[PDB]
Design an enzyme around this catalytic site. Structure first.
Site, PDB file in Angstrom:
ATOM      1  N   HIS A  78       0.713  -1.218   0.089  1.00 37.12           N
ATOM      2  CA  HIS A  78      -0.084   0.153   0.043  1.00 37.12           C
ATOM      3  C   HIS A  78       0.862   1.269  -0.006  1.00 37.12           C
ATOM      4  O   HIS A  78       0.432   2.319  -0.211  1.00 37.12           O
ATOM      5  CB  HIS A  78      -1.149  -0.105   1.165  1.00 37.12           C
ATOM      6  CG  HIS A  78      -0.454  -0.098   2.271  1.00 37.12           C
ATOM      7  ND1 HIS A  78       0.328   0.971   3.006  1.00 37.12           N
ATOM      8  CD2 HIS A  78      -0.785  -0.995   3.559  1.00 37.12           C
ATOM      9  CE1 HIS A  78       0.797   0.655   4.143  1.00 37.12           C
ATOM     10  NE2 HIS A  78       0.099  -0.258   4.586  1.00 37.12           N
ATOM     11  N   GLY A  85       2.971   6.072   9.775  1.00 37.31           N
ATOM     12  CA  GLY A  85       4.388   5.603   9.077  1.00 37.31           C
ATOM     13  C   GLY A  85       4.917   4.409   9.948  1.00 37.31           C
ATOM     14  O   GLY A  85       6.299   4.162   9.557  1.00 37.31           O
ATOM     15  N   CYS A 143       4.243   1.310   9.367  1.00 40.01           N
ATOM     16  CA  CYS A 143       4.164  -0.109   8.402  1.00 40.01           C
ATOM     17  C   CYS A 143       5.412  -0.275   7.819  1.00 40.01           C
ATOM     18  O   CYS A 143       6.355   0.417   7.707  1.00 40.01           O
ATOM     19  CB  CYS A 143       3.298   0.273   7.124  1.00 40.01           C
ATOM     20  SG  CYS A 143       1.444   0.699   7.969  1.00 40.01           S
TER      21      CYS A 143
END
Ligand SMILES: *C(#N)[C]([C][C]1[C][C][N]C1=O)[N]C(=O)[C]1[C][Si]([C])([C])[C]N1C(=O)[C]([N]C(=O)O[C])C([C])([C])[C]
Ligand SMILES: *C(#N)[C]([C][C]1[C][C][N]C1=O)[N]C(=O)[C]1[C][Si]([C])([C])[C]N1C(=O)[C]([N]C(=O)O[C])C([C])([C])[C]
Ligand SMILES: [Cl-]
Ligand SMILES: [Cl-]
Ligand SMILES: [Cl-]
Ligand SMILES: [Cl-]
Ligand SMILES: [Cl-]
Ligand SMILES: [Cl-]
Ligand SMILES: [Cl-]
Ligand SMILES: [Cl-]
Ligand SMILES: [Cl-]
Lengths: 305, 302
Positions: free
Chosen positions: B41, B143, B145
């Site tokens: 993503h 942030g 991920c």
């Protein structure tokens, strides 16, 4: 977003851990530059662990009695000295993995990360607080001495603890990196008892703010107290006093959440006098006191290292 | 003595964390050999976060649309491919700090350490378990991920989780390192609800044994129970059923303490029936379910 008991990344400390052997006794050492630090009780023998004369034991010892191993490579000891309860072994090779470090002494209520090690190999990391009675509720087995506690400030590792011994209640005692013990303990295998412990009130308040930041708000109430009233209540429940400094340090959290420090103290006073009423806070049925105000801010803002 | 929630040392994982940027999106990557793994993503546009066609989006990307930064140096992306929900950016430089590693997919009840990172840099390490509903109760901000869950056996890192998203309840969902989501979750900003969370009963029992090893006795009783009678009671408390597999796994702890598994099960039923009455177990006023039998043995014993 969630809130967890979180330790600092341990990579910088891992690269400093070595194995120190004085004959039968084997424990861990902290290899910084060309010096390896370890508890002085490594030179002790079962002949007299009760009342060891450390200065005279060390006089008998030469450099060849200390075996230092870094991984699968033997470090050559070219000198030895004692400072308080830590033995400093000088080695012929500086540690290429030495990070920017400094030795600090922490106060009761402050938290730090412990890197538990066995045979010089790191095996686990956990976060704990220096209790008001100067012990730590750690997790240590045989051979864990030399394991260190530390914080990281910007790019700098702050070594604050080295593990020495376990008390009969299961709590642990150690020294700073200058070898001075936290609390009224000696490195002898004799009957020693930690004093009655108390709850770190400032840390409890910071943890309550962390709950409010995470949406847990059932404990908030309309009331406020002053520092005098709250301190009288706190001492009755074996809670540490809350100083004006503690109020100042909680200031940024108070502004963020809209809950003044004395506003939160009113919530804490009600919790102490009335219990949780079956409710929980951040998944806990007790009031957590192992998060400093700085820990809460750091975790709720994403500070990295 | 002493029992603590304990994570694995994170150094072997710190040497692999990098920053991945695509367009205006920045998250973390795991740099192993010449491949950087991150959530796919990272290429999702703000125009359509509901039904992103990631395969269509990745075809329109070039290597110059991906910025990877390791430390202060910029890595050159020379290839990109997708495996399930994970993006694999091939780089021109192999990570010299790559440790011995393997990819493992874990089952509910399993625990692991999380290295929470932001902008490619480690922020902290904590412990958690895969919940029975396939989520994790993590601690993640924007942030985060690309942050990974891992275990360490000897000197080998088992990567088992990569963080992808936060559900409306505040729990977190992610994939293994092959990009396959744990549970019925998708990497789309669409209506997704986790199932009812239940207690990992086997982990609770292992934790009670840890308490006994550490000197706690007050919750023990003289009763025992059949496995079915225990399960019937426990499920009324939103506890996971205990299988014969769990009983066998608890065997070594049972022999070490001299308390039979079904004996300890009778103690658990008493605790659920009565509560704590102001007492604590291993410094906790609730039953803890994020220590496996393997964790208990490793921490309590050699
Ligand atoms: C180190 N290595 C060990 C780790 C200990 C034992 C298990 N858990 C721990 O934290 N520490 C020691 O061997 C020290 C060195 Si000593 C002054 C020669 C004895 N000692 C102790 O911890 C002893 N405790 C004590 O005397 O406190 C009053 C016990 C645990 C061996 C009795
Ligand atoms: C990464 N980086 C982030 C971290 C998240 C956001 C805050 N806390 C976390 O753990 N992950 C995301 O932004 C993902 C990727 Si998305 C499919 C483009 C949306 N998303 C979400 O977490 C969203 N939740 C969701 O879609 O659950 C179905 C919200 C929280 C941003 C709305
Ligand atoms: Cl002496
Ligand atoms: Cl000296
Ligand atoms: Cl922890
Ligand atoms: Cl020992
Ligand atoms: Cl009110
Ligand atoms: Cl403080
Ligand atoms: Cl602050
Ligand atoms: Cl562990
Ligand atoms: Cl898919």
């Amino acid at each position: 977003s969630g809130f967890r008991k979180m330790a600092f990344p341990s990579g910088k400390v891992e690269g400093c851990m070595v194995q120190v052997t004085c004959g039968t006794t084997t424990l861990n050492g902290l290899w910084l530059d060309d010096v390896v630090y370890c508890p002085r009780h490594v030179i002790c023998t079962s002949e007299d662990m009760l009342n060891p004369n450390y200065e005279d034991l060390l006089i008998r010892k030469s450099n060849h009695n200390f075996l230092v191993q870094a991984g699968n490579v033997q470090l050559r000891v070219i000198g030895h000295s004692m400072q308080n309860c830590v033995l400093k072994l000088k080695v012929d090779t500086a540690n290429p993995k030495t990070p920017k470090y400094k030795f600090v002494r922490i106060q009761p209520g402050q938290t730090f990360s412990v890197l538990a090690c066995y045979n010089g190999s790191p095996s686990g990391v956990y976060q704990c607080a220096m209790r008001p009675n100067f012990t730590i509720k750690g997790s240590f087995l045989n051979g864990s001495c030399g394991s260190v506690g530390f914080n990281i400030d910007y790019d700098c590792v702050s070594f604050c603890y080295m593990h020495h011994m376990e008390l009969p209640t299961g709590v642990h005692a150690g020294t700073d990196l200058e070898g001075n013990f936290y609390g009224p303990f000696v490195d002898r295998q004799t009957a020693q008892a930690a004093g009655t412990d108390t709850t770190i009130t400032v840390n409890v308040l910071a943890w309550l703010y962390a709950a409010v930041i995470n949406g847990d708000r059932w404990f908030l109430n309309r009331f406020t107290t002053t520092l005098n009233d709250f301190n009288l209540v706190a001492m009755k429940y074996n809670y540490e006093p809350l100083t004006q400094d503690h109020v100042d340090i909680l200031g940024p959290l108070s502004a963020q959440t809209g809950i003044a420090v004395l506003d939160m103290c009113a919530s804490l006073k009600e919790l102490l006098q009335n219990g949780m009423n079956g409710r929980t806070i951040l998944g806990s049925a007790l009031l957590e006191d192992e998060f400093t105000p700085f820990d809460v801010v750091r975790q709720c803002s994403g500070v990295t290292f």
